[PDB]
Amino acid sequence: DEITKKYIKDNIINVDDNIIKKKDIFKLKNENNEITECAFEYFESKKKFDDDIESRFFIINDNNYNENINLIYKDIKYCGLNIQTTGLEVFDENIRLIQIAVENYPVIIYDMFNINKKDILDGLRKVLENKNIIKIIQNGKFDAKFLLHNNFKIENIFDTYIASKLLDKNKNMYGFKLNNIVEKYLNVILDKQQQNSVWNNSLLNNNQLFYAARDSSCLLKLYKKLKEEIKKENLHIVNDIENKCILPICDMELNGIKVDLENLQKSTNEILNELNIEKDNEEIISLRNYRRLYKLYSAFYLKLPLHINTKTNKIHTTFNQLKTFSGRFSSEKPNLQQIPRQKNIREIFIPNDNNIFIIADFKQIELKIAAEITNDEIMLKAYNNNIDLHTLTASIITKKNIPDINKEDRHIAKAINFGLIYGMNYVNLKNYANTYYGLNMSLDQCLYFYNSFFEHYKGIYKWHNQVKQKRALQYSTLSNRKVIFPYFSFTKALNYPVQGTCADILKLALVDLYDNLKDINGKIILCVHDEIIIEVNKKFQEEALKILVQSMENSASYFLKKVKCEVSVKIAENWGS
Ligand code: NA
Numbered sequence: 001d002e003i004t005k006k007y008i009k010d011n012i013i014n015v016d017d018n019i020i021k022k023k024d025i026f027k028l029k030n031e032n033n034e035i036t037e038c039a040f041e042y043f044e045s046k047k048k049f050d051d052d053i054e055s056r057f058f059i060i061n062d063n064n065y066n067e068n069i070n071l072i073y074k075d076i077k078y079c080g081l082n083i084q085t086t087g088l089e090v091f092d093e094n095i096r097l098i099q100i101a102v103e104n105y106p107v108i109i110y111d112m113f114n115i116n117k118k119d120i121l122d123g124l125r126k127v128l129e130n131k132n133i134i135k136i137i138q139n140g141k142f143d144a145k146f147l148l149h150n151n152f153k154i155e156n157i158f159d160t161y162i163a164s165k166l167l168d169k170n171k172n173m174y175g176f177k178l179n180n181i182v183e184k185y186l187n188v189i190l191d192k193q194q195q196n197s198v199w200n201n202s203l204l205n206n207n208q209l210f211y212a213a214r215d216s217s218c219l220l221k222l223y224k225k226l227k228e229e230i231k232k233e234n235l236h237i238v239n240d241i242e243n244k245c246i247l248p249i250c251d252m253e254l255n256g257i258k259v260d261l262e263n264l265q266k267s268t269n270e271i272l273n274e275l276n277i278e279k280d281n282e283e284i285i286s287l288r289n290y291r292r293l294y295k296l297y298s299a300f301y302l303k304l305p306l307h308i309n310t311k312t313n314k315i316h317t318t319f320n321q322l323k324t325f326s327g328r329f330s331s332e333k334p335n336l337q338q339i340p341r342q343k344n345i346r347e348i349f350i351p352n353d354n355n356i357f358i359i360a361d362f363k364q365i366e367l368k369i370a371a372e373i374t375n376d377e378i379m380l381k382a383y384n385n386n387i388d389l390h391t392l393t394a395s396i397i398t399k400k401n402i403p404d405i406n407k408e409d410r411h412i413a414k415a416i417n418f419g420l421i422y423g424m425n426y427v428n429l430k431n432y433a434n435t436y437y438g439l440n441m442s443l444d445q446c447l448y449f450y451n452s453f454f455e456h457y458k459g460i461y462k463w464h465n466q467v468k469q470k471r472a473l474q475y476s477t478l479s480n481r482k483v484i485f486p487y488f489s490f491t492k493a494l495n496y497p498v499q500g501t502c503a504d505i506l507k508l509a510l511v512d513l514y515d516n517l518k519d520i521n522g523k524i525i526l527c528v529h530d531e532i533i534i535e536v537n538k539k540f541q542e543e544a545l546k547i548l549v550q551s552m553e554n555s556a557s558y559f560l561k562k563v564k565c566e567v568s569v570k571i572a573e574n575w576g577s
Pocket residue numbers: 082083084138215
């Protein structure tokens with residue numbers, strides 16, 4: 001095979017006989033400041049492509065290299081970053097190729113396997129590092145993980161998937177592939193034909209480089225149009241937050257979380273013993289106890305070891321920030337939000353030797369947001385004077401005073417608050433309290449709760465009547481996250497703004513946290529519900545404490561402009577304390 005052996009010096013296998021090595025002159029304007037033209041050797045296709053998408057490209061080996069190529073980067077503002085790797089899991093794979101697409105230029109492809117001189121990469125590294133160069137990516141979290149793990153400081157990322165996923169206003173589950181997005185906004189059907197490629201071998205296939213290169217080219221025009229649609233429907237803030245939240249997410253996944261095997265397998269054998277005890281064993285006893293221990297055992301304790309990286313005893317879960325309807329985070333394999341909320345269990349999660357955990361929580365942020373969005377004078381003033389809404393509600397229900405209040409009144413107040421705020425009638429309220437609070441409150445009594453509640457909280461009353469009357473399907477957030485319902489659901493309609501705003505505060509907090517937590521080399525570990533976990537060296541204890549508090553408070557203060565959030569923090573050696 002002579003045609004196949006045609007471009008072996010460039011580590012390319014010519015299968016379809018469709019590749020051409022062309023050496024020509026390029027019109028650069030760099031060097032010093034004068035227009036300096038330079039000759040390069042690029043590759044082109046014999047077969048002409050249908051629509052107008054760049055397919056010409058350079059390949060970079062340690063053998064063949066031209067410093068002048070770096071001059072292409074000089075004075076750019078955005079580029080199409082797209083890498084190909086030897087698999088999925090970064091920790092057990094290597095980066096094959098790294099591609100950069102530049103306006104009106106053929107794609108630049110670094111071959112990482114054949115390269116060996118570091119000097120070359122300095123161009124790539126400088127670009128990726130350059131805070132002022134926008135790197136356009138498809139599924140940026142993935143590539144970003146690989147790069148950060150392979151030590152490539154990246155910054156200023158624009159994610160096409162995020163853009164497309166937001167412009168969807170969350171009304172479609174599928175249709176977010178590169179081909180689909182391009183086919184939609186650019187109106188160009190990609191040739192596709194991408195079979196299961198093997199980047200592991202040192203010979204690069206012919207067609208795969210073309211298609212791959214195109215997958216970079218389209219990111220430019222696509223970035224332009226998507227950018228335009230974003231700034232049109234006012235989603236700049238959202239995009240800013242999310243696209244900046246990429247790196248924090250990568251930090252979470254890369255850092256993982258260490259687990260103690262002693263207490264783990266101890267609890268395994270113990271709960272297993274109690275399980276078999278219940279197996280050998282009124283009604284509530286056998287049923288609830290057996291199935292409870294069964295879930296804690298099989299559905300948790302037996303599941304967890306699957307994701308334990310044996311040698312490190314770390315769990316590296318995968319996070320998602322747009323697969324959630326509300327907008328909050330979602331973790332999978334395992335699902336951290338699915339793990340029980342007890343002390344005995346979570347105790348098995350520990351920091352590393354010279355490190356220590358810091359765990360922050362947002363207190364009553366749901367009702368705080370609801371208070372501002374609703375703009376209820378009574379609730380806002382109650383918060384401004386540092387008073388728990390449950391204490392308030394309890395005082396309004398029982399007509400007691402703050403000294404004469406008692407814990408049970410706060411209990412009832414909790415049921416009433418979390419019940420009625422999210423819109424529900426006194427009947428369902430009785431069921432809700434009777435189920436989740438075990439309170440035999442008469443229907444008349446719950447009616448009294450309803451009337452007193454809404455009679456006092458006129459803000460909430462107006463909010464409810466507004467939503468219930470307009471019966472809108474479109475809904476937004478303080479970050480302006482638009483969502484479209486299929487049908488008008490009252491509860492969901494009331495709930496979405498709150499949950500969404502909460503999510504926004506969490507993400508913005510993680511971004512600010514990721515940027516502030518660098519000096520003491522502090523690590524981000526976890527974000528579940530309304531609590532965040534960071535791991536820092538025992539030296540930076542009080543420091544990291546102040547940092548975390550200030551960061552979250554700055555976020556909550558960014559969105560909320562007339563409510564002060566209470567961030568309760570605990571410096572711990574365990575998740576449970
Ligand atoms: Na790709």
